[PDB]
Amino acid sequence: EFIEFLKTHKTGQEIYKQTFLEGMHYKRDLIEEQSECAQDFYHNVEKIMDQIEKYIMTRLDEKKDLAIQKRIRALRWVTPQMLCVPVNEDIPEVSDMVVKAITDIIEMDSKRVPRDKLACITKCSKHIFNAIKITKNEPASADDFLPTLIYIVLKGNPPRLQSNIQYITRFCNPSRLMTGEDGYYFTNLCCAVAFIEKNLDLLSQLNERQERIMNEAKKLEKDLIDWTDGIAREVQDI
Amino acid sequence: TRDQVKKLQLMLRQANDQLEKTMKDKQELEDFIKQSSEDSSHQISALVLRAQASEILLEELQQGLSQAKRDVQEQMAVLMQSR
Amino acid sequence: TRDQVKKLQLMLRQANDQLEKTMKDKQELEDFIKQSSEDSSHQISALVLRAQASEILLEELQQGLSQAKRDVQEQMAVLMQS
């Protein structure tokens, strides 16, 4: 599939002939090296980046996450009070949203690419937004989202979580972290787990913070082009 | 007259080089905090490397805005060609 | 020529209060750095500082664009009628 995608330019087929793979076999036998190498490979080189990720992840630590598990089955005593979460699981429709928010986050570890783990953790976030929205009959507020997410990680135990989150950070293309969700939902997961070991509001507010200025940035990045053209586009009418 | 124009230039240029040095001191304390970001512990690499992507996206927009200004002006130059 | 003299004083004064302003900034950066050397959750608040710094810059760029539009707008008006 990656071969058929690369074929149909031929410079992408030169990337098919290029394969960093032998260099990976060399440097990764002694962990932080392969992260910088993959990031360098991505920096040197358009959806073919996701296809190269799709290949390299399918082919190419991952242990000791227990500390979370013991701490989660610990935190079993925690009720949606003091998480102040807007989720009322009595109504069937939200209980069904919660269940498959969890089902998603479980499904993550099973996944192929880091990006496909990212796809999972969006849908988890989306179902969380649904659980909240159906509860209060009103769209979730950003301050609501983060706690509710932990609650989904706090009950139900995704196989090998910290393994997953370190693996995604290691390689996936940080063209990720700019505008778009899967990485905003990601950084929310990080904030979630990091919080779990004993403020929340700060973590929510800070995520809102960064996400906005990145929205505004990708706007101004455009309006520059819009203005540039609009004036050039028009200086030459007459 | 010349006198207070000789001494004020002295004091003004001494104020400028002091001010500009202070700014650099500030920019170094800032960079130090940017270097306090990534470490072994209490990380959330996620948040840190978000804040990175942000400020990296803005420091291109300065080349963007500058070049937006110089490219609009080069268009003005051809409107000057109109005659 | 007191034209210069009176402008030099103005520029000197402006450089001074602006410098003091640069200093209060430097000071609090120092006061911030001296505390919680590691792991106090003060480097989350360091991340919000990087936030606000990027938020003053983002806006400088925004208002910079809007003015650039006007300068070009009225300049275009000139080169039109002239």
Numbering used by the authors:
A (entry chain A): 141 to 148, 150 to 160, 163 to 173, 175 to 189, 205 to 219, 231 to 368, 391 to 430
B (entry chain C): 553 to 635
C (entry chain B): 553 to 634
From the paper:
In this process, small GTPase Rab5 functions as a master regulator of the early endosomal biogenesis. Rabex-5 is a specific GEF for Rab5, Rab17, and Rab21. Rabaptin-5 is a key effector of Rab5 and plays an important role in both homotypic and heterotypic fusions of early endosomes. The GEF activity of Rabex-5 is autoinhibited by its CC domain and is activated by the binding of Rabaptin-5 via its C2-1 domain.
In the R2Δ complex, the linker between the Rabex-5 GEF and CC domains was removed to facilitate the crystallization. On the other hand, in the structure of the R2Δ complex, Rabaptin-5C212 forms 2 two-helix bundles with a V-shaped conformation, and Rabex-5CC interacts via the nonpolar surface with the C-terminal regions of Rabaptin-5C212 to form a tight three-helix bundle. Rabex-5CC (residues 413–452) forms a long amphipathic α-helix (about 60 Å) that is in agreement with the prediction by Delprato and Lambright (2007). It packs in parallel with the C-terminal α-helices of Rabaptin-5C212 to form a tight three-helix bundle with its nonpolar surface buried in a hydrophobic surface groove of Rabaptin-5C212. The interactions are dominantly hydrophobic that bury a total of solvent accessible surface area of 2664 Å2. The GEF domain packs along the three-helix bundle formed by Rabex-5CC and Rabaptin-5C212. The interaction interface buries a total of solvent accessible surface area of 1040 Å2, which is much smaller than that between Rabex-5 and Rab21 (2400 Å2). Hence, we consider that the substrate-binding site of Rabex-5 is largely exposed to the solvent and partially accessible by the substrate. In the structure of the R2Δ complex, the substrate-binding site of Rabex-5 is partially occupied by Rabex-5CC and Rabaptin-5C212, implying that further conformational change(s) of the R2Δ complex will be required to bind Rab5. The not-so-tight interaction of the Rabex-5 GEF domain with Rabex-5CC and Rabaptin-5C212 as observed in the R2Δ structure allows the conformational changes easily during the substrate binding.
